[PDB]
Amino acid sequence: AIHRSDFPASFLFGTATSSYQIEGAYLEGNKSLSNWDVFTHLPGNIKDGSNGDIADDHYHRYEEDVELMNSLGVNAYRFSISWSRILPKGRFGGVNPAGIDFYNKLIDSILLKGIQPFVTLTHYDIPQELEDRYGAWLNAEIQSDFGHFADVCFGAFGDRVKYWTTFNEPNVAVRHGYMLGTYPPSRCSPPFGHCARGGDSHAEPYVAAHNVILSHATAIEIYKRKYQSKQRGMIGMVLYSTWYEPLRDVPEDRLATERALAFETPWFLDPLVYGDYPPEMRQILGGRLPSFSPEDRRKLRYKLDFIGVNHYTTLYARDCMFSDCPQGQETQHALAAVTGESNGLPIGTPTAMPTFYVVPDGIEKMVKYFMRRYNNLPMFITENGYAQGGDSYTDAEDWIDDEDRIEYLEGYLTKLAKVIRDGADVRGYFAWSVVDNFEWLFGYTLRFGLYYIDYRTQERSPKLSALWYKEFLQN
């Protein structure tokens, strides 16, 4: 139904991964332990008790994986840099040459094939030492550690990297880390949970996000002052971007939907474009959102060059400001509750990933929301994809037969082409993911790959969706 010629000639088409999810070699090349290395070696977090010690062994097998994505006909590859490989002990501990060498080799390998790097600096990971030393995102010192990490990466790689992302889904990582306590550093308080480390779910998430925002600001100021004129790249941020519809078409749910939306991506994007937190959030949270100092505001004037849209799903939102709702969900402070069901029944076909429903027009509506709120600031679809999982899959052939993924990709790409025809400045699309990999708390139980991975042998095998994406990119 949809074809490559339905998109602009200069459009990026790629796949996306992250370092912890694919690399393995978790203690090789003088790399230090990350937050996720430490976390996954504790019990009671990952669904299948797995970890990323080995993952897809991409640290050793990257050349094969580059060859595979090249065989699909991609012109870009979205990946992240392991902080713990570059600055194992943070900014006073010296740059790790083996880490620099690994990413130089990866970058050179993709560019040899005409595949453009689209690089995420941080994608949930930090060296554990930064948590241990000063509590990572709860201390403003992280801004300097992140700034230094950015500076090193720009200097080492930026002659060949023209697209950078500071952070991947900090809206997810912050709320899971400090509100629900289900991600490291596993901090929370009632009514969200009882976290043995302590926490404050009504304060700490907002401090953490504040420091993420200002870490971005620190990094992009460095980029614009030191590197932009020579390197001519763009610096963005990637946000988890769910579309929301009112459960009932009445003002209270419409307003709740607008709150649900404003509490997600604008939490980060309003500061980076307008210099203040969303007024929807400020009205409710007041002083729980920290202020931006004059020094902060100087850095915020560098803004961001693009919005990285990680869009997978669409949900209904309903009001909790004037109705009593269950407490302790991540949407609590927004005074909305979200659900995939209306009168018991799904918004679109359910999938193996909780909250992920097949709702293609969500990508159009999400893009239009950014267009209206941010005056059509450039966007890239930095992740979109479909997970397989569960008892229907006993062997490779079952995973390979992924017509369900094809239908998803086809539908969402159809709607993306439409929103671009309608004026949206979307400049690329990245399928999550080229390979099955470690899906955070779900471990290996969810498989998002265009390629199937046998974790016993590390064999890569193309699923039907790999063949489909190749056909699509051939036009």
Side-chain angles (χ1 to χ4, degrees), residues 1-390 392-475:
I2 195 64
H3 304 100
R4 185 162 183 178
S5 61
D6 301 311
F7 294 81
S10 63
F11 204 78
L12 305 184
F13 279 111
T15 64
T17 62
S18 78
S19 63
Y20 191 74
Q21 298 180 266
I22 73 171
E23 286 180 4
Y26 85 110
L27 286 168
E28 297 197 33
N30 319 301
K31 180 190 159 289
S32 63
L33 295 171
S34 70
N35 61 339
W36 275 85
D37 291 321
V38 174
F39 183 72
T40 60
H41 287 235
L42 298 170
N45 40 47
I46 315 312
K47 181 173 182 187
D48 60 359
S50 68
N51 58 50
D53 294 3
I54 298 175
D56 302 298
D57 194 34
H58 177 85
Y59 190 78
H60 302 105
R61 302 170 190 264
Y62 67 89
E63 190 52 51
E64 179 184 4
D65 294 338
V66 172
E67 285 286 350
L68 293 176
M69 66 186 65
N70 189 50
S71 82
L72 306 180
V74 300
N75 63 10
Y77 172 46
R78 173 160 184 265
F79 67 91
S80 80
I81 293 171
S82 178
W83 198 330
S84 305
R85 289 197 194 285
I86 301 304
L87 287 160
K89 296 180 71 68
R91 73 185 176 108
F92 303 116
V95 175
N96 175 32
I100 298 290
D101 294 347
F102 175 67
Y103 295 104
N104 270 328
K105 183 60 171 190
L106 176 65
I107 289 164
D108 291 347
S109 296
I110 59 164
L111 284 167
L112 184 62
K113 305 301 204 199
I115 297 169
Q116 301 165 55
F118 197 102
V119 181
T120 310
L121 291 168
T122 297
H123 192 130
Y124 301 178
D125 63 300
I126 52 161
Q128 178 63 29
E129 188 155 349
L130 301 188
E131 176 56 46
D132 290 344
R133 195 182 295 175
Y134 57 67
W137 304 105
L138 299 177
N139 194 297
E141 188 63 25
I142 197 65
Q143 295 172 33
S144 299
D145 263 296
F146 187 77
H148 189 57
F149 170 53
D151 192 13
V152 167
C153 292
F154 297 150
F157 312 126
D159 61 299
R160 284 154 294 131
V161 176
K162 309 299 165 201
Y163 302 98
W164 299 91
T165 296
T166 53
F167 293 93
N168 178 85
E169 302 188 355
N171 53 326
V172 175
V174 169
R175 291 202 172 95
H176 289 6
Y178 300 92
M179 195 178 287
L180 275 193
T182 53
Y183 274 22
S186 314
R187 297 178 67 77
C188 72
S189 62
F192 296 85
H194 291 274
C195 286
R197 288 177 186 76
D200 183 341
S201 295
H202 215 172
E204 292 194 356
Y206 304 108
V207 174
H210 198 71
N211 287 315
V212 172
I213 289 158
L214 294 173
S215 294
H216 166 97
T218 299
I220 194 172
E221 179 175 62
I222 286 160
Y223 191 77
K224 297 283 190 166
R225 290 187 180 186
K226 193 169 175 181
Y227 297 105
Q228 175 82 55
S229 65
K230 196 160 202 78
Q231 298 182 350
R232 301 286 166 185
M234 292 171 80
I235 315 300
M237 188 182 278
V238 165
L239 286 308
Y240 180 61
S241 303
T242 295
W243 184 243
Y244 290 107
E245 288 284 342
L247 181 55
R248 294 183 305 121
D249 185 27
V250 299
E252 61 180 5
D253 282 2
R254 291 169 198 162
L255 197 69
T257 298
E258 288 151 16
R259 288 198 298 279
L261 285 160
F263 271 72
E264 288 289 4
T265 67
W267 185 14
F268 293 83
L269 295 173
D270 270 27
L272 298 181
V273 178
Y274 298 111
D276 273 310
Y277 285 109
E280 300 89 342
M281 294 186 70
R282 294 174 74 190
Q283 176 169 17
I284 291 167
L285 292 165
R288 292 176 182 287
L289 292 163
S291 68
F292 294 111
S293 70
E295 306 97 277
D296 295 340
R297 291 177 172 284
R298 183 177 41 76
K299 295 175 180 176
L300 292 170
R301 301 266 184 175
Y302 293 93
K303 301 180 182 170
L304 81 174
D305 300 323
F306 69 84
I307 299 164
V309 183
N310 283 7
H311 175 79
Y312 291 88
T313 195
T314 302
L315 300 169
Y316 299 115
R318 78 186 181 85
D319 175 67
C320 301
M321 193 176 279
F322 314 109
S323 288
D324 281 1
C325 290
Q327 301 300 279
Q329 296 300 105
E330 285 179 333
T331 57
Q332 188 188 295
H333 301 147
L335 300 169
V338 302
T339 178
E341 301 171 11
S342 174
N343 300 312
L345 289 174
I347 194 167
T349 309
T351 78
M353 173 64 88
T355 79
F356 282 21
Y357 298 87
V358 184
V359 190
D361 70 354
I363 200 165
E364 166 179 27
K365 292 176 197 305
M366 189 75 256
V367 167
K368 285 198 265 184
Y369 181 86
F370 293 127
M371 287 174 73
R372 295 192 319 269
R373 197 170 182 114
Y374 302 110
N375 290 135
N376 204 19
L377 188 67
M379 296 158 289
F380 292 88
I381 308 306
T382 42
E383 296 183 18
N384 175 249
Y386 179 88
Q388 300 158 294
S392 295
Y393 307 90
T394 54
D395 59 36
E397 184 183 2
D398 298 332
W399 300 109
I400 289 160
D401 184 10
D402 68 337
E403 290 163 61
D404 51 348
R405 179 170 296 104
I406 290 171
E407 284 175 23
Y408 183 97
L409 297 176
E410 196 162 331
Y412 280 71
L413 284 161
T414 300
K415 294 298 180 180
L416 184 63
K418 185 178 180 295
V419 79
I420 296 162
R421 280 200 301 285
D422 294 353
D425 193 1
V426 182
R427 299 186 187 183
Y429 175 91
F430 294 85
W432 184 276
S433 181
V434 65
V435 293
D436 297 334
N437 62 67
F438 178 84
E439 188 44 39
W440 305 115
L441 296 178
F442 299 94
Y444 300 99
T445 70
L446 294 179
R447 287 179 178 267
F448 271 101
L450 297 173
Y451 286 83
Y452 166 74
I453 306 293
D454 185 331
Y455 292 113
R456 184 173 70 81
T457 63
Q458 293 292 344
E459 185 178 352
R460 281 64 171 143
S461 298
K463 304 182 191 170
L464 296 171
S465 60
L467 308 182
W468 183 91
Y469 199 40
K470 178 179 171 76
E471 226 174 75
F472 172 81
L473 295 174
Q474 286 175 349
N475 197 46

